[model samples]
Target: AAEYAVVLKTLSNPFWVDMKKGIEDEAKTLGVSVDIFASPSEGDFQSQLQLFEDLSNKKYKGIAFAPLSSVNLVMPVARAWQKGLYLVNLDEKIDMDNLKKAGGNVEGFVTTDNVAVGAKGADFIINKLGAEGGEVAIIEGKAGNASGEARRNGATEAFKKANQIKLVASQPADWDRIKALDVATNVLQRNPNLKAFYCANDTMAMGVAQAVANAGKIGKVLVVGTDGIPEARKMVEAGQMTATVAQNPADIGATGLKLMVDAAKTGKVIPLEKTPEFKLVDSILVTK
Candidate 1:
């Protein structure tokens, strides 16, 4: 029996778009209808909430959300659970306590294991700059988004393990390359001794690379990031970026839909829920 699955994402970036493509391709193969909805931007929480409400009324068989903010998504998930919807949190996990208070509607949660993603980025920077001690800044994605936050934390932990590197300014870059550029420029100005910059994703890393060049310090510092978007990978190959953790987001969407369809049909949902199985999306560290 075919099922109805909806993927809610944040539309402020190409990353989500790519993920949607993967989800659609996979769903089509499995004979499932996949609906993709995205918030206009990071700040458009109300509209995102509205999408879930609207989908709830449509009698969707299963729902998946790559939430915009960790805290803001609880109410809608609660309401949907109250309506007996099968729910899954994708890309980022919600407040587990709140989800439980709402009736534990979450069948499962899936993401790239972002801590490892961040650690990969940190390791690249450390190895590139040699065994010497140095300062650095992190260009973050949107505020309060767990993916970037986890990536930042993982990077911090990995870098801390390197006795020589001291992370001086770990600020948010809003996941925009331009924002990353400006923030990196300012951080460089404040911390002239900075030898590397780590961003949560590729777009921001692009900005940091530009900023470093503008400040005439491109070769002097290493830059790394996650989500090796095509352009970001190119930059790494060209020596503009030191490395990035390649997150196959599109594959996540495609394969995730397939999993949900199978889980829903086999009465395996609850059992599967207790023992969560995540498809290991390959994480490749790309560098020159």
Candidate 2:
């Protein structure tokens, strides 16, 4: 039996699985029990909600989550708060506007400085490709998800100022690797001269890279990704990918756990604005 518990949207993605590794590693050092659970399918928010309900009843000292939706989590989080659980929001942000619908009490939200992540990665692509006025594609996360929307917005804003990058196609990848593969292939087929692909997370980025490679333009096309998952890094090292925005998924998990565990002992909320201990984690432009 764990003293605390964590719930993620799913562990199917290597990014999330690696995050679990970090959470467990830190839990061991802290001498506390940590239990992790995730939905079987990324499509089922209902199942995730059920897991949250089940966890609330376990009397866990604290609960942490990487939700599937940003706007869809208000009610579930409120229910956890009503049950007297300390909550940590990880990987994604809760839609602040929906907080009232859910009963409005979540303790902490930890996520990549995704806005900057997008801008930095996009800038890297625009600069390196010399596509000062080129066409780009955006492979976003699940529709209406916070990370997806935020990164897209940041990238668009940056692109607008550049006067060189015109986003030709932008659509949801639903955070699936294979989905990104198909989407990117279509985008490439539609625009053979597409300069770069900006993926919301590295999982999808890898798929996009595969698609570009399948099109036999891997070296000529620019692909930028996020999430810093190990597989993405390996691809970067291999010169199969152009560059990736590294988010330090392990750091996100470890840092959130440190705060949640602290809250459990002190009976206080994690500081809402402690700079979030954020890092660009840097972006790597893969070059063989």
Candidate 3:
């Protein structure tokens, strides 16, 4: 019997690939059957909603979901809750006020502190730039995304505190590598002396690195990215990128699955008073 399931943003990224492996590995250890699905694209809200609707029809006892849109999933979550599904939020968090107003209830949540993720990248950039910092820029993810916004804010705030670092530009790349390449290249051209770049994700970081290389500033301009993807790690090894704030996506997946399984068996997640605290997974700095 497929007693548990997980739905995520997308499977194309290496982050989700590791997350899938972790979920499957934990399911095997726990002696449970868990089905996993992903949205066709990172921003495909309709497809994700359809997947959730299909899962609801299947009447799975428990589900772990990472909503693509922060607020758009409230109605679907409410419907799934009404059907007595043990729901656990994973990765990106939904807007709690809106979710409750829409009658959606989640058993628990598991995610990384996105703000800290960004701050870590900023910290790495600061160290690389030294006390006499120069112009810096940020390549952001999709606009209005809770995780991306949090990461952007975290880095922005860190830059505020660092007196030596001058932020020349911060713009969205829409999580697209080619777009990021163009944005980064333009920033480099305008600033000319831009010393560092903090990308919200490794995918964009790759683009920034490529832009730096194209501009003939590989060693001169340091690039720090979020999500320690394998490609990013390889780039760091080859001295193309400086560092990445590596997140344990697999840990999040494994932990979310465990919580769902336990909720299914015990018929309880957390005490109602606590408001179901998010299970926070720590991130580490990956550099070569």
Candidate 4:
């Protein structure tokens, strides 16, 4: 019997690996089966859509998904809901207005306040540079992604207020470490006085940190990343990276799994708790 499905971005990323662990661990406690799936990479929308479509056809009791693109999954979510699967939006939320316009339903949502998370990174950078800020840059995730854009907006807004902080570069690395490394290297070369980097996610930050090290500016340049993955935490401890705004990926997985199990057992689309369509989990700043 097909129980439920938990779809994520990629297992190659440690953040998703932790999320998977939470889901699997909770499913064991609940005694329900869950099939985990992911795209090969963050940009693989077609593969993710196909996986969701296949799961919808299987008629599972519930589904928890973190979509790569907000618009691409709208129709698929509508189709899945029409087939009577209770959907839980995890991490990246679907555009509710658009989903409703297309007659789709998502029961619950679980994710961090991404805007605040990004602002936290910006604050860290600004504080590190002190009252007299220097040149800074950002390595963003895939362009137009809901979470990525929100983070960028938050950081951009923060920088606007900080007159001393000069935002020298802001570019999309598409969440690829190698791409971020190349982009950061170029940005550094262009702005030799660049003081800080705020990466939208930890993977890109790893690359940026490496670029800083390669340029022999490790102590001079500050790198702050989001998603507080284990590797990023180690970097923070070792003083390689300045800090990271950490999202509880495991908590997100556990919450979504619990919701799915509850919906399955109670035969209710909405849980007893008043979990809004857009729910926010807390984000913590991890620094040395």
lDDT of 1: 0.77
> Which segments of candidate 1 are over 4 A away from where they belong?
1-3, 266-280
Each model's backbone clash number: 2, 4, 0, 0
Ranked candidates (lDDT, high to low)? 4, 3, 2, 1
Q: Could you tell which candidate, 2 or 4, scores higher by TM-score? A: 4
Model 4 clash pairs are: none
lDDT per residue for candidate 4 within 9-74, as digits (tens), equals 899899999999999988888888889999888878988989888888885788899998877688
lDDT per residue, candidate 3, 1-288, as tens digits? 388878888888899889999999999999998899998777788889888888888957888988877876777877887778888998888887777777667888899999999888888888888889878899998887788899999999998899999889999997778899999999999998899999999989999999999999998999998889999999999999999889999999999988888777877544323486469999998887
Lowest lDDT 10-mer window, candidate 4?
A: 270-279
lDDT by residue for model 2 over 1-288, one digit each (tens)? Answer: 588889887787777887899999999988889999988877878888778777887778888888878765567777776667778888787776566555555566667777787788788877886744588888998988877888888887877788777888989989888999999999999997798888988889989999998999877887888876778888888888888887667777887888788767777543333322332233343443
Sorted on TM-score, best first, the list reads 3, 4, 1, 2
Better of 1 and 4 by TM-score: 4
lDDT by residue for model 1 over 1-288, one digit each (tens)?
125555455655667878888888887788777777887776677787787777777767777777777767788777766666667677776776766666555666668888899888888788877867689778888777888889989999998898899999998977667788889999999998999988898878888999999999877988887887888888888888888888888877776676667667765344222534466566778877
Give candidate 4 regions above 4 Å deviation: 264-276
lDDT of each: 0.77, 0.79, 0.87, 0.87
* TM-score of every candidate: 0.91, 0.90, 0.95, 0.93
- Model 2 regions more than 4 Å off: 131-133, 268-288
